[PDB]
Design a protein around this ligand. Sequence first.
Ligand code: HEM
Ligand SMILES: [Ca+2]
Ligand SMILES: [Ca+2]
Length: 329
Amino acid sequence: ATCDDGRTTANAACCILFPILDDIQENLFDGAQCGEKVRESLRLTFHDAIGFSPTLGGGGADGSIIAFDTIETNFPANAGIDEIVSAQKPFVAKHNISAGDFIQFAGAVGVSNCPGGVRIPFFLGRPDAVAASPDHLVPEPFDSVDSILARMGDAGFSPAEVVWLLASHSIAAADKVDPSIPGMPFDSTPGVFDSQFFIETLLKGRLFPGTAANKGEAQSPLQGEIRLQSDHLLARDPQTACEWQSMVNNQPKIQNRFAATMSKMALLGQDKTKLIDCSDVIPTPPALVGAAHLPAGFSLSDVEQACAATPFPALTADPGPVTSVPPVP
Ligand code: HEM
Ligand SMILES: [Ca+2]
Ligand SMILES: [Ca+2]
């Protein structure tokens, strides 16, 4: 099919997505930047979709977190999610797209803004949300590895898939984990979708980045960087450690596994065969910037070898003394 200006798309239905693309790039993503709203939008795709259980209920990737926002944004596990829900609501109302479609579309478009990012498949046609998600379906950073893997598994994700989805934390920061110091990222490159998150979580912890250890927080190897306890444990757990370590300096795998598993997550509670493939609408992301490295002042001795099958790859450290991670703008 073709759109008004002759651009090819596999289905004519996808043409309605282009004005939505332009509007969000300009008015949600601050001129197609990989910034705060991109990160919050990626996070929202998860908080919307993970509200899904074959036995416990929830319609999954159905836009319920927007359509029933007063209920869902008040779940303890959804702390801080109100701001991005509130920012996205006018776009949903203004455009001719369901809330479930908009959330996943905004996430895929956002990721395409990030250097090293990957194009996530996108399907159009999710119905309006039917009911609010049940509470207690969103994993929390203080949950045990077994609890987290059981909840994600109930939703349909294997431990390896949990690792692949956690590539999202390569472009991520926290406001609620430690309320005193908002905007500390989970890796040293929160604006670059790269392997630094998997490297840095495997380093021996050194400090608590604020003035307090908070619930759900582990020791961080870097000042200005925050480490979730869930990430700390998943990096090292036998169920996940070899998968975690394999992401290190493996950009093609990070991209490929993230795209595939995000697509699967965006379809929770949905039937892809009743939807329309509009993947070709998502822009090509900019290429990776920077390279895999240990932070400056670190050596391979700082790695906590958790994978038994294979040793950590022999990365080199950035030059100079150990430095802090600047807060995200
Ligand atoms: C599997 C268990 C997970 C846990 C326990 C977890 C936990 C967290 C926490 C505590 C935050 C910080 C919230 C705050 O204080 O502001 C966060 C941020 C974030 N999460 Fe995860 N997460 C998980 C999985 C995922 C998945 C599957 C995605 C996929 C899209 C994702 C995407 C993000 C993003 C992009 C941010 C950054 C938000 C921002 O920069 O504003 N997370 N996560
Ligand atoms: Ca939902
Ligand atoms: Ca990064």
